[PDB]
């Protein structure tokens with residue numbers, strides 16, 4: 032009843048995608064899967080450019096590729112259309128606009144809203160992306176429970192733009208209060224609003240692309256174990272709240288073993304995994320469910336990232352397959 | 354040359370310990386190991402009381418124990434001297450002191466130092482711990498790269514107490530500025546400083562216990578793979594910076610396989626693990642290195658947490674052991 036191909040081949044072939052996120056519990060393969068998929072995209076689309084971004088403060092993209100990446104787009108050895116970059120947590124208009132915001136917000140209740148650094152980090156990031164003309168950006172995220180980088184900016188944008196309105200109108204005398212508090216002219220304050228409003232508008236427009244299922248999708252990564260399914264349920268619910276598309280899950284570390292497998296370790300673990308794979312098949316029956324097998328070695332270097340990518344688009348046949 | 358028992362038995366038997374942290378890369382077994390060890394402590398010391406705290410916003414202690422825990426100490430089924438609690442991120446003196454701090458700090462450069470919520474979260478936590486009289490608190494931390502909860506408060510304490518000094522002395526007219534800015538009397542400001550200074554002093558005294566190797570130790574958890582050793586090196590360096598003791602690592606998911614093991618998956622993976630275990634044996638030759646074997650099933654429920662704890666103090670004999 033509506034066979035979903037157990038692969039990311041449809042995502043790979045959907046060239047409208049501008050933003051692709053991979054996420055899930057600690058240790059499930061976010062870095063391995065995002066890195067492998069970004070190689071697959073780059074090698075199948077050599078006439079386009081791609082950016083892999085780590086937003087996990089525990090950056091592991093360098094060690095996955097066995098190549099030193101930095102805080103600026105770095106070209107991947109052997110895949111010259113692929114760039115990788117570490118994004119850290121949180122010009123001089125920043126200082127001025129921030130002070131204007133923090134002062135003006137304290138004129139109303141709950142007026143200490145966070146993520147003004149976030150906004151400026153993100154404005155910088157759009158700088159790079161338009162300049163270098165990437166067709167798609169791939170995110171290697173931090174584990175679930177760690178706040179999703181950039182995904183709440185639409186609510187930040189809204190509070191800033193309403194403050195801009197209040198100041199322009201002198202709503203309840205906020206402008207007078209700010210001028211008298213900061214010793215700025217009406218023209219100084221209007222100058223800060225006017226010069227930065229286009230920057231905010233860009234943030235508004237790209238944040239909307241996160242919520243457009245043609246431009247953005249979020250791929251879940253999990254292991255077939257109680258705690259990882261729990262974290263996956265909570266990631267899927269949080270993405271619904273944020274109006275962001277998630278229709279694909281990669282189940283990683285899948286054992287190629289059954290009741291007839293000699294190894295008693297692989298045999299019993301495969302029994303455990305079977306319960307949780309069936310639970311995922313049931314719960315997410317409209318998703319692409321990709322079975323990424325346990326490999327004989329860690330997934331480091333392009334040869335390994337390439338082999339890992341093959342099972343993202345060519346569904347692996349397990350001894351226990353139908 | 355200085356045989357370290359490959360177990361946590363010395364830590365288990367060291368009753369001076371008040372604070373024990375478990376940490377490491379995403380997915381390596383922080384929750385499993387902290388939960389198991391906290392059961393072991395509670396069952397070996399039934400006449401004392403123990404608190405297990407999750408500071409991973411992705412709280413998994415409930416699912417590890419298969420018991421619902423909340424935001425207040427919850428008594429563990431079958432282990433009545435053991436309590437478990439989820440600690441979330443960030444009375445009315447809070448609001449007032451915070452406003453006093455944020456105002457007074459802007460009178461000097463870099464005067465926007467973070468973690469005033471942190472401090473108040475922590476003051477609350479010491480409340481519970483002294484009241485309920487726990488001999489030891491065990492922390493299930495967030496992954497490496499995620500900021501270590503409560504461990505930077507000594508530097509927060511210092512900036513607050515110097516502001517207190519400045520205000521008391523009217524250093525460079527900061528007191529006048531604050532009185533005129535906030536419309537408080539000298540006596541109002543002195544009242545806020547005097548009433549909360551004892552609260553700060555408590556934070557100062559307990560933060561110091563984190564840095565006393567008789568009262569506090571940090572146990573590393575890793576898997577024998579490149580990325581996990583990298584994250585472990587970076588956790589160990591960060592704990593040196595913070596003057597916090599780390600002399601124990603648990604290597605988890607260790608395969609009981611060698612060249613003679615029939616299973617080609619377990620045989621090759623054991624070859625990979627062997628390289629990284631030898632690297633850990635070399636690099637951390639003054640540490641307790643505990644080998645926690647891969648188990649046939651996920652570690653959920655007290656029976657499993659108990660079995661897992663046995664290999665924390667009784668070193669497992671592997672087919673490949675000396």
Ligand SMILES: Nc1ncnc2c1ncn2[C@@H]1O[C@H](COP(=O)(O)OP(=O)(O)OP(=O)(O)O)[C@@H](O)[C@H]1O
Nearest residue numbers: 057058059060061062063324325326329330379578
């Ligand atoms: N299918 C697989 N078979 C074998 N090893 C794998 C597989 N997938 C990932 N690995 C290895 O497992 C480890 C964990 O993977 P990875 O670091 O990609 O996870 P993560 O979700 O990014 O972790 P973190 O939460 O720490 O960011 C790595 O050492 C990686 O090489």
Ligand SMILES: Nc1ncnc2c1ncn2[C@@H]1O[C@H](COP(=O)(O)OP(=O)(O)OP(=O)(O)O)[C@@H](O)[C@H]1O
Nearest residue numbers: 057256379380381382383384385646647648651652
């Ligand atoms: N030795 C082991 N053998 C088999 N399964 C294990 C072992 N240790 C842990 N597990 C299982 O592996 C999974 C990951 O462990 P756990 O959740 O404790 O790691 P963590 O470091 O707390 O992860 P996170 O970074 O998400 O907080 C769990 O499903 C747990 O039951």
Ligand SMILES: [Mg+2]
Nearest residue numbers: 061062087091
């Ligand atoms: Mg990662």
Ligand SMILES: [Mg+2]
Nearest residue numbers: 383384409413
């Ligand atoms: Mg955990």
Ligand SMILES: [Zn+2]
Nearest residue numbers: 040041043044
């Ligand atoms: Zn195709």
Ligand SMILES: [Zn+2]
Nearest residue numbers: 362363365366
């Ligand atoms: Zn003993």
Ligand SMILES: [Zn+2]
Nearest residue numbers: 294297616619
């Ligand atoms: Zn096996």
